[PDB]
Design a protein around this ligand. Sequence first.
Ligand code: EVQ
Length: 345
Amino acid sequence: PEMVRGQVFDVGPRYTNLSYIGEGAYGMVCSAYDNVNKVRVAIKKISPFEHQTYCQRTLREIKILLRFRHENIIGINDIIRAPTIEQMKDVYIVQDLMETDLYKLLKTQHLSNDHICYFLYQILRGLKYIHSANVLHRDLKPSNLLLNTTCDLKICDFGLARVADPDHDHTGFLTEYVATRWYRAPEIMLNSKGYTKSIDIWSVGCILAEMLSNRPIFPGKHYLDQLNHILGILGSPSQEDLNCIINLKARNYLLSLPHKNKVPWNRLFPNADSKALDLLDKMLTFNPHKRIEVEQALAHPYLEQYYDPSDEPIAEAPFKFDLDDLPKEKLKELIFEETARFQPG
Ligand SMILES: COc1cccc([C@@H](C)NC(=O)CN2Cc3ccc(-c4nc(NC5CCOCC5)ncc4Cl)cc3C2=O)c1
């Protein structure tokens, strides 16, 4: 058994010569030499079985990523675990190893307009596929966009993903939410559970803005401050957009705020391509019904050099699970079944 940073990595014989990459709440990640394909790969060790929420994230990730097949979506190559449920305490998920991510790149590198254009195209091309499967990613952000040394981009981390459910989207004002604060659409804080495709478009809009300036556009410091930052740039919502918020707590909160004018994009982003700012505006629309969709975004003049719907594939079938009430002991069973194809035979 190889060890890395006070942690067993029971991934052999196939995977050797481990180097530490990182760690987080999810577990730990290393690169390893794959002795079948003769490449280094990313391997993340997940130890989720003592927490139902970690089992949920693990199962969503595995189920979604094994179904999906797309150039701009990270795949799963292999899954290593014990041969029995009883002996299974860890799951190792093997994925293509990528050089860096967009969070890291934005902290250190100015992006040319051509880089911004290519990254955005790739994000939207991947998202077209995700949305075509009736799936919402729900946590799109720079650290979930992986990059290789030739700037090929792959969306990762589907642990918060869901099947779209627009007819159950409505909730009350200030309802708690899990996905990353800075990339949350304004409606999350007002009347949405984040069960529509428009939640992901907002996040992409925020990423686009962050590409233009290397700084998050709406860096809120707590739940309602996120709405403060959004309205600080978009300005007060129109009467029409307010009328779509039927919940009185949410509407009356908005009506209580002093009138704020829209900050023009070309003042926040003086060096940006005007077509990029036009698409930005459409992605960062307050009213989610008026927000541009993924396929429209791809057809936008900013992306004309890349746009090709015949080369922007969709999923063969809409995705459906066979649940959020299930005990961590049942989710372990499902993780066991779902990983079985990677065992000898
Ligand atoms: C939050 O609670 C949980 C509980 C249980 C399970 C999970 C599950 C669903 N969550 C993840 O698994 C999220 N994670 C972590 C993670 C780590 C590295 C990678 C990666 N990284 C590089 N390269 C690195 C090299 C240096 O610069 C940055 C990129 N290549 C390829 C890959 Cl798959 C991808 C990921 C990824 O999706 C979460």
